[PDB]
Amino acid sequence: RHKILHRLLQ
Amino acid sequence: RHKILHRLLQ
Amino acid sequence: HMLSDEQMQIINSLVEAHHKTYDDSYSDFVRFRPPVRRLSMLPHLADLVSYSIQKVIGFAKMIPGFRDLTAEDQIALLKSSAIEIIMLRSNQSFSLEDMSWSCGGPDFKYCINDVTKAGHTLELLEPLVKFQVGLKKLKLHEEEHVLLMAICLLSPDRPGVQDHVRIEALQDRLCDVLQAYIRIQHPGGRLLYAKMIQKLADLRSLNEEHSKQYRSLSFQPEHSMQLTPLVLEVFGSEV
Amino acid sequence: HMLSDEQMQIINSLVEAHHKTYDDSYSDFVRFRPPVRRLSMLPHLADLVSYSIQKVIGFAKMIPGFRDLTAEDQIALLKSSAIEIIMLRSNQSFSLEDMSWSCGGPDFKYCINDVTKAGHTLELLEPLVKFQVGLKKLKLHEEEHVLLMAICLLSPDRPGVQDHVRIEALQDRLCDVLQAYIRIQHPGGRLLYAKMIQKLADLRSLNEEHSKQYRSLSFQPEHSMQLTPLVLEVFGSEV
Ligand SMILES: [C][C]([C][C][C][C+2]1234B567B89%10B%11%12%13B85%14B%1158B%12%11%15B%139%12B%1061B%12%112[C+]5%153B%14874)[C]1[C][C][C]2/C(=[C]/[C]=C3/[C][C]([O])[C][C]([O])C3=[C])[C][C][C][C@]12[C]
Ligand SMILES: [C][C]([C][C][C][C+2]1234B567B89%10B%11%12%13B85%14B%1158B%12%11%15B%139%12B%1061B%12%112[C+]5%153B%14874)[C]1[C][C][C]2/C(=[C]/[C]=C3/[C][C]([O])[C][C]([O])C3=[C])[C][C][C][C@]12[C]
């Protein structure tokens, strides 16, 4: 999923 | 899944 | 008239369960991410609530009959009542004098404004504080407070419960223990049982509002990343 | 001979990216769950590592070309190199004088024994400290240290990478910038480039060991519940 990663990568 | 709950409920 | 030995045993077990899971020194609070007075109180409040969920699990496991239920019913009961048990148990640190929750120093003194700093609105906060005031004014005996938490936890009318007959039978036994205790041990408590049942109803609206506000916060990965795994599991909808 | 304006631009951008993501005051450390000196250092070290992963993401996003890759390649690069970037960047707080990582007060002074208290063994810890000593003894210029982190992050030989040609082209440009910098700007650095390439190889064994030890800790829900969502996402195998 990578919800946090995707969001941090903007 | 409830990995933490199950474990805490022993 | 008096209570039976079975009713006395239930009260002693519940009071013992509470003493084992509620620490009057609040000494563990220093281990949480510190309070910061955007969404500055979120880390501390998440750790406080995560710690309190563990305590509620611990208390639930010592409620007579609770451990005999399936793992799934125990989860269903815990998932939908934990926030209500937290609200009930928090009343022990709530003070009418300052309208805040005092857990030792001013370090762990929580007011409405501090909870606003974890993302909550007055829609939850104002009825939460009114509930705390009303419950504190009931001046519940430790036996009653402990019976009320156990009654709340054993509500069969929760989503996901399977053995509804068993749970309702457990809760009824607890309500009888409560009604008999007030009658025998509480002077001026003629209207008390009914007032306590109303507080359980008030808790459903608080739960409803909290769920909405949690859903709103948890949807944003910048705030959800600040939560603990246990909070995500318990307040999360992945049942 | 000298470096081109493009090579100079790359170095300036990388040094700027590092200054933006590395805080020499270590003032954010007070916001972590406090250090406790079973598995007493786990909460603090999890928060320290979670905080450092955010910094590594921040640095990666400013590496020229990195943001142009697909989200999936960026994830694949970050997921397998983050622990290596953390090990590299930690060298800035590492001291040969005490063989520990000093981040301000003795509060944030980490020795091998402290890391043992988060569940790690000497199998990882002894080669980690030997790596830190060797890297500190290289006495890298800030330009070299920053180039080494970016070279490490842009390794196309990682599981899950799709655009291997693009990544290897980005890394090569960085290696040329590094080779040219040492040659032009570093006296006595004749054997340096090769020593730095060996440190990247050493990092693969450290990564290998760390992965094994993380897998072992994370399997137990009593320790996994102490981790942060970001740590679980980055070190987790749910890619
Ligand atoms: C709305 C709040 C719930 C937030 C859930 C949240 B906040 B945010 B995020 B953060 B994470 B997610 B969101 B919200 B949802 C989850 B946390 C309240 C509920 C009871 C309050 C309280 C209790 C005090 C005590 C002290 C002592 O009597 C022990 C007792 O057990 C106890 C908890 C004082 C502060 C605010 C509360 C925690
Ligand atoms: C084995 C360890 C990795 C643990 C991952 C873990 B531990 B446990 B659990 B806990 B959670 B899961 B497991 B293990 B795995 C994840 B944490 C080391 C790696 C670098 C070390 C270090 C760095 C210092 C700094 C200070 C400063 O220079 C900034 C720099 O970025 C930085 C991180 C000092 C302490 C021990 C470390 C974090």
User: Quick one: three-class SS letters along D87-98?
Assistant: HHHHHHCEECCC
D76-115 b/e (C-beta count within 10 Å ≥ 16 → b) = bbbbbbbbbbbbbbbbebbeeeeebbbbeeeebbbeeebb
Identify residues after which chain C is interrupted (C–N over 2.5 A).
Answer: 37
| Set of chain D residues whose Cβ sits within 8 Å of the Cβ of A3 | 233
CB-based touch B/A (3+ pairs, under 8 A)? no
Q: What are phi and psi of D132, to 5 degrees?
A: -65, -40
Dihedral through CA C160, CA C162, CA C163, CA C169, nearest 10? Answer: 30
Dihedral through CA D196, CA D198, CA D204, CA D206, nearest 10? Answer: -80
Looking from the CA of residue C115, the nearest atom of ligand 1 is: 36
Reported for C165-170, long-range contacts at CB under 8 A and 24+ positions apart, including other chains, are: C166/C65, C166/C69, C166/C73, C167/C69, C167/C73, C167/C77, C170/C63, C170/C64, C170/C65, C170/C66
Give the CA angle between residues D184, D185, D188 to the nearest 5°. 95
Dihedral through CA D221, CA D223, CA D228, CA D233, nearest 10? Answer: -60
Task: Calculate the CA C32 to chain-centre distance.
Answer: 19
Cα separation, C230 vs C233, whole angstroms: 5
Cα separation, D9 vs D6, whole angstroms: 5
Within D31-138, where are the H helices? 42-61, 71-89, 112-116, 122-137
A7/chain C closest Cα distance in angstroms: 7
Give the CA angle between residues C52, C53, C55 to the nearest 5°. 65
Tokens of residue C202, six digits = 């008030």
Domain spanning D1-239, CATH architecture:
Orthogonal Bundle (1.10)
Looking from the CA of residue C94, the nearest atom of ligand 1 is: 28
Q: Are C14 and C146 in contact (CB under 8 A)?
A: yes
Identify residues after which chain D is interrupted (C–N over 2.5 A).
Answer: 37
Tokens of residue D171, six digits = 């890394």
Looking from the CA of residue D48, the nearest atom of ligand 2 is: 33
Cα separation, D179 vs D17, whole angstroms: 20
Tokens of residue A5, six digits = 């990663």
Chain D interface, mutation test: which of A4, A6, A7, most D Cβ atoms within 10 Å? A4
Tally: H helices and E strands in chain A: 1, 0
A7/chain D closest Cα distance in angstroms: 10
What chain C residue is nearest to A4 in terms of C-alpha separation?
A: C221
What is each CA distance from C108 to C30, C39, C87, D213, in whole angstroms? Answer: 9, 17, 16, 36
| Set of chain A residues whose Cβ sits within 8 Å of the Cβ of C221 | 3-4, 6-8
What chain D residue is nearest to C228 in terms of C-alpha separation?
A: D228
According to the annotation, is D44 in a ligand binding site? no
- DSSP letters, C165-177, are HHHHHHHHHHHHH
Dihedral through CA C197, CA C203, CA C205, CA C207, nearest 10? Answer: -150
Residues ≥6 apart with Cβ < 8 Å to D193: D178, D179, D182
According to the annotation, is D120 in a ligand binding site? yes
Q: What are phi and psi of D110, to 5 degrees?
A: -105, 120
Packing angle, helices D164-185 and D192-218, rounded to 10: 130
Chain A interface, mutation test: which of C225, C226, C238, most A Cβ atoms within 10 Å? C225
Q: What are phi and psi of C116, to 5 degrees?
A: -60, -35
Packing angle, helices C5-21 and C42-61, rounded to 10: 150
Burial of C97 per CB tally in 10 Å (0-12, 13-18, 19+): exposed
Residues ≥6 apart with Cβ < 8 Å to C130: none
Chain A interface, mutation test: which of D54, D67, D77, D233, most A Cβ atoms within 10 Å? D233
Chains linked to B by 3 or more Cβ pairs within 8 Å? C, D
What chain D residue is nearest to A8 in terms of C-alpha separation?
A: D57
D231/chain A closest Cα distance in angstroms: 10
Give the CA angle between residues C80, C85, C89 to the nearest 5°. 170
Partners of D94 in the beta sheet? Answer: D101
Reported for C160-166, long-range contacts at CB under 8 A and 24+ positions apart, including other chains, are: C160/C72, C160/C75, C160/C76, C160/C79, C160/C80, C160/C239, C161/C73, C161/C76, C161/C77, C162/C70, C162/C72, C162/C73, C162/C76, C163/C69, C163/C70, C163/C73, C166/C65, C166/C69, C166/C73
Interchain contact B1–D (C-beta under 8 A): no
Residue (of D224, D225, D222, B6) closest to C76 by Cα position: B6
Within D219-236, where are the H helices? 221-224, 229-235
Task: Calculate the CA D186 to chain-centre distance.
Answer: 23
What chain A residue is nearest to D230 in terms of C-alpha separation?
A: A4
Q: Are D236 and D78 in contact (CB under 8 A)?
A: no
Ligand 1 cavity residues, CB under 6 Å: C 42, 45-46, 48-49, 52, 86-87, 89-90, 92-93, 101, 103, 110, 115, 118-120, 124, 214, 217, 227, 231
Give the CA angle between residues D102, D106, D111 to the nearest 5°. 55
Q: Are C207 and C84 in contact (CB under 8 A)?
A: yes
Chains linked to A by 3 or more Cβ pairs within 8 Å? C, D
Packing angle, helices D122-137 and D71-89, rounded to 10: 80
